[PDB]
């Protein structure tokens, strides 16, 4: 008899992230999974994923150049950071 | 007898993200999955995903150039960050 | 006997994101899935996804150039961030 | 006997996003899925998706240039962020 | 016996987004799906989707240029953000 209690009585003003998972019983194969319940991808890159069956098989002259550059600013305050009775400020003068 | 209790009694003014998942019983194969319940992708890039069966098979002269640059600003306050009785401010003077 | 209780009694003024999922029992194959219940894609890019069967098969002279640049500003306050009795402000002077 | 209770008694003035999903039992194949219940796509781009069977098969001289640039501003306050008794303001002087 | 209760008793002045889904039992194939119940696409672009069977098959001289630029402003307050007893203002001086 599964019997799960999470955050039953709450009095006040909290700041909560709740993730409750209850369970009971080709190139990429995925089966019966849970992914990225609270997932953050800010600057994620991916080149040439799962190209396929028999690419560039017989003859190929490939020039792969990946120039990642340039002025990029990522200013984040309280990433996945619940708060209460606090002061969060981003000041970019 | 599955019996799940989440946040039964709530008195006050909380700030909550609730994700409750209850369960009971080619190139890319995906089967019976839950993905990205709370997912954030700010600057996500992907070149040449799942091109297909037999690409560039016999002969190919490929020049792949991925120039990622340029002034990009991402200013975020309280990303996936519930708050209560707080002060969140983005000030870009 | 599945029996799920979420946020039964709520007194006050909360700020809640609720996602409850209850369950009981080619190139891309997807089957029996739940995706992106609370999903945010701000700046998402994708070039050449699922091109098809036998592309550029015999002979191909391909020049792939992906120049991503330029002044882009993304100012976000309280992304997926419920709040109560708070002060959220974006001030861009 | 599935028996689900969500937010039964609510007294006050909350701000709620509710997503309840109850269940009981080619190039892209999708089957029996739920997607994007609360999905936000602000600046999403996609070039050359699902081109088809046998494209550019015999001979092809392709010049693919994707110049993404230009002054673009996305100012958002309270994205997927329910609030109560708060003050949300976007001030662009 | 499926038996679902959502937001039975509501006293006060809430601000609610409710999405309840109850269930019981070529190039792109889609079957038995629910999509975009609360979906927002602000600036979404798509070039060359599902071109067809055998395009540019024998010989093709293709010049694909996608110049995305220009001054574009997207100012949004309370996107998918129900609120109560609050003050939402967009001030663009």
Author numbering:
A (entry chain E), B (entry chain C), C (entry chain A), D (entry chain B), E (entry chain D): 11 to 35, 57 to 124
Pull verbatim passages from the article behind this deposition.
ATTR self-assemblage caused by mutations in the TTR gene leads to variant ATTR (ATTRv) amyloidosis. The four structures determined in this study vary in the assembly of this gate, and we classify them as the closed gate, the open gate, the absent gate, and the broken gate folds.
This population of fibrils has a crossover distance of 689 Å, a twist of –1.26 and, and rise of 4.81 Å. The built model resembles the structure of the fibrils extracted from the hearts of an ATTRwt patient and an ATTRv-V30M patient, previously determined. In this structure, the N- and C-terminal segments encompass residues from Pro 11 to Lys 35 and Gly 57 to Asn 124, respectively. In the exterior of this channel, residues from Glu 63 to Ile/Ser 84 are forming close interfaces with other parts of the structure, and residues from Leu 58 to Glu 62 are exposed to the outside of the structure closing the channel, and hence acting as the channel gate. We speculate that the prevalence of this population of closed gate fibrils may be influenced by the content of wild-type transthyretin.
